[PDB]
């Protein structure tokens with residue numbers, strides 16, 4: 001509340017709490033972390049990315065996004081945690097310190113502000129954006145169906161009323177469009193991670209096609225390593241594989257897009273649990289989720305810095 005050291009990481013926060021946190025952290029580590037506004041959401045809320053950097057030109061960078069699907073509250077919670085941890089581990093953890101010395105990290109905690117507000121406001125289980133319009137009384141697009149990676153194919157609904165609506169066209173949602181433009185403009189991203197919940201999966205491309213990525217052996221071996229890492233803390237068991245194979249065919253997904261942009265290291269995480277609590281994971285499992293997912297992510301990032 002008064003400092004990032006006083007913020008309660010073991011509870012779920014609202015939008016303004018999260019935003020105010022961002023500003024604290026920036027304040028406490030001005031040499032390490034910047035706040036960027038890459039856009040504004042459908043209902044005009046600012047969209048923020050934290051950049052963690054030790055300097056340099058346009059260093060290779062790591063993208064992380066959380067909270068694309070608003071009801072997956074454990075993601076935004078992990079995101080806050082990550083932010084602090086980056087600030088904590090730099091100069092303490094030799095590994096993490098080798099990473100930031102050579103790459104930047106871009107973290108988007110609340111990818112989907114509007115639907116986030118709406119989960120607190122009115123329906124806890126809202127998933128989509130809050131876009132309106134057209135020949136529909138139904139609001140919102142499945143932002144993780146809106147990307148230009150086999151847009152509109154099977155694995156997404158063309159019904160506005162659908163929980164998996166894909167929207168009117170690829171990149172129609174300003175929440176997506178804004179990441180698209182920013183990553184295309186940066187042009188030096190090496191990894192692209194998107195955090196979801198639940199069902200404990202680590203996923204690489206594709207979702208939209210049966211076709212194998214050419215990097216399949218590496219990304220699988222990376223996935224494998226990551227999963228092994230994560231499990232090490234608390235013994236949380238994760239399955240890994242390509243989307244379509246592991247979860248289901250899904251079109252217009254983040255990772256397919258990123259990967260098609262030449263960002264080799266594209267992974268999505270589906271965090272705890274497996275169905276016991278589902279989206280309404282207990283405040284008590286925040287920290288132990290964050291810690292373990294951490295190791296998973298840190299393993300991807302070391303692989304990244306190394307190849």
Ligand SMILES: O=C(O)C[C@@H](Cc1ccccc1)C(=O)O
Nearest residue numbers: 144196197198207250253254268
């Ligand atoms: O919602 C989730 O957590 C599941 C996620 C499966 C997915 C992963 C990566 C890419 C595309 C689709 C989705 O349905 O968006």
Ligand SMILES: [Zn+2]
Nearest residue numbers: 069072196197
């Ligand atoms: Zn999701």
